[PDB]
């Protein structure tokens, strides 16, 4: 009804789409703030299908500003070709982004009032559920190993048992090095082959095995520690070409004169 729509108040556009939670975002954007006045950057990590998005984001009135960014689609640069959205890929992306931002900030390889003031950042996962062993916590661990000191407890890392309040480092290492994927491949090696031919098809094409996956992950970690230079694509068919391509199929709004002409014939 007209009255219902008039009284109805539309929520925020960024909240109407299920992407941001203003209740949790408020705490990070505006902290206690009566303590010492210091900038507080936010490490936003988001997981999508076939890709992982990690970004270091600050706060500004005009909108969030990204200081550095990393994506799982850049992992093949280091030799990772499969499982870009897996736990090991999340850990690798976290380590890569952490080391990249550390190198860009000058910590490796108004600066007054020593010391260097290491880059502290708070992780943000948005709507991602808080479950122990989630690959988001794997990205957190990778970033922590990369030099970004996110304050975090080990209550959600994989292998954390509830019966005993102790983290099993062996299970965490296995998850970091793709041990679970290798175990699944070994299990499928003697199970139905149709699933083994469909699942892990890329692994079979690349001739990957149980230990080769861990070796590849270690080599990728070493390369990440070696080349965080963040080289983007050559960008063939540059911005103007892409704009022309989009405009080719784009539908333009009809002018009011066209609407009047159409209505004149309609009536």
């Amino acid at each position: 009804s007209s009255a219902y729509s008039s009284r109805f108040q539309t929520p925020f556009r960024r909240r109407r789409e299920g992407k941001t939670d203003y209740y949790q975002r408020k705490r990070l954007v505006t902290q206690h703030k009566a303590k010492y006045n210091t900038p507080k950057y936010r490490l936003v990590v988001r997981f999508t299908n076939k890709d992982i998005i990690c970004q270091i984001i600050s706060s500004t009135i005009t909108g969030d500003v990204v200081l550095a960014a990393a994506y799982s689609h850049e992992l093949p640069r280091y030799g990772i070709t499969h499982g870009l959205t897996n736990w090991a890929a999340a850990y690798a992306t976290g380590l890569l982004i952490a080391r990249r931002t550390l190198q860009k900030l000058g910590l490796d390889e108004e600066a007054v009032e020593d010391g260097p003031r290491p880059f502290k950042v708070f992780l943000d996962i948005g709507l991602q559920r808080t479950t122990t062993g989630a690959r988001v916590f794997g990205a957190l661990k990778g970033a922590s190993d990369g030099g970004l000191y996110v304050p975090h407890s080990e209550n959600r890392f994989p292998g954390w048992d509830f019966e005993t309040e102790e983290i099993d480092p062996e299970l965490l290492r296995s998850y970091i090095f793709g041990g679970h994927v290798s175990q699944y491949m070994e299990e499928l090696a003697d199970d139905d082959e149709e699933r083994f031919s469909e699942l892990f098809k890329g692994y079979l094409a690349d001739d990957i095995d149980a230990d080769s996956l861990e070796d590849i992950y270690t080599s990728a970690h070493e390369a990440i520690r070696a080349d965080p230079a963040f080289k983007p694509t050559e960008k063939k068919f540059t911005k103007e070409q892409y704009a022309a391509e989009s405009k080719k199929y784009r539908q333009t709004k009809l002018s009011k004169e066209e609407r009047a002409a159409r209505v004149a014939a309609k009536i």
Binding site: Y36, T38, E113, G115, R117
Partner: protein, 182 residues
């Protein structure tokens, strides 16, 4: 390159609010809205004032702790923070002082008599004939024991005890209302 600033009148600073006051003369024509270079003069003046304020702020002593993160309230040893003095400018308060006073008719007697304030030890009190403390009040209080016990020798006396408790609570509320009337 130069950082020193010289003005006919020294700048009055307010470090407690990160504020600086400049009483120097300003040219009406230069700052007129019709002047194209209006913005440049204001920018230069603000730059000089900010340079002076920054120099004064950095001249202040700064804390240097040797602790770790630990409690997030404390600052890390790597960090060093300028110790801003108390504000010099007087600003009006948003509300009046809450220093309301009332003796409730009890403090007057307590002063007249030699009744010292109770030590306020705690809720715990020993419940004889049992191997449990069962504090006086706060949880499973002993005052409720009479209701849960099985024989009430010498109308249910438990209802009488509950009525007495209600009467005492209502009397306390009435005393509070009487004291509020004052």
């Amino acid at each position: 390159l130069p950082v020193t600033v010289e003005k006919p009148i020294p700048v009055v600073y307010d470090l407690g609010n990160l504020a600086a006051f400049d009483s120097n003369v300003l040219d009406k024509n230069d700052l007129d809205s019709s002047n194209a270079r209006r913005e440049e003069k204001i920018k230069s003046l603000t730059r000089d004032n900010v340079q002076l304020l920054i120099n004064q702020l950095l001249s202040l002593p700064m804390k240097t702790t040797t602790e770790s993160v630990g409690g997030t309230g404390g600052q890390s040893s790597v960090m060093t923070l300028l110790q801003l003095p108390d504000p010099t400018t007087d600003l009006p308060r948003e509300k009046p002082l809450p220093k309301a006073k009332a003796m409730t008719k009890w403090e007057k007697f307590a002063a007249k008599k030699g009744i010292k304030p109770k030590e306020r030890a705690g809720k715990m009190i020993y419940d004889e004939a049992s191997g449990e403390w069962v504090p006086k009040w706060g949880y499973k209080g002993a005052n409720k024991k009479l209701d849960d016990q099985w024989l009430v020798e010498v109308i249910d006396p438990r209802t009488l005890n509950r009525a007495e408790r209600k009467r005492l609570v209502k009397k306390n509320e009435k005393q509070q209302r009487r004291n509020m009337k004052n």
